[PDB]
């Protein structure tokens, strides 16, 4: 294949594979275009995953090529694609305010002047 | 591995494969425990499929091992199993009757006017 991505070093490989037998696969589900599922890794394993496999801005894993995620010891049939995030059904809208939403309004509260 | 079933001769193989580009696959669908789909063969191809691949009492193909149906040129991903038919909902009950069921009743009725000698 010629590994598309950043192949893991023999050491990296050997330390991640320790968790292989504990990786968990959810049942598949589907929509109008796709078939879906998620793989849950044992947290411990996160600690041993190279840092270039991470999204420094979020703390989650960056997108992984198939060779890469297969490299981690995650194993599944053909044609599965890794994606970063999954939007809910169109009738359901997600929200959030920063725990200190007040400080910020209070900030722009005296600001007014 | 090797081969489960009645592998096709080089002649048969060559014969059937002529239709491979015309074999059609339906979209998959699923219920609780299974995923489903069907493959539709070009009728022409039916004529060239060996006859031991058939169910003489029905005219449909007998069950096919994976190697066997792969042999026919039908190609799909892993884990697919070939089954003969789809039973209907459990509250629906199917029945059939020979078109000549009377032939036999005429026989029995007759046969009961024969050994109806019990005198």
From Swiss-Prot, chain B:
Binds to the catalytic subunit of the cyclin dependent kinase (CDC28) and is essential for its biological function. The chain holds residues 6 to 124 of 150 of the full protein. It comes from the Eukaryota. Keywords: Cell cycle, Cell division. It comes from Saccharomyces cerevisiae (strain ATCC 204508 / S288c). GO terms for cellular component: cyclin-dependent protein kinase holoenzyme complex; cytoplasm; nucleus; SCF ubiquitin ligase complex. One of its GO terms (biological process) is cell division. Forms a stable but non-covalent complex with the CDC28 protein and with a cyclin. This is Cyclin-dependent kinases regulatory subunit.
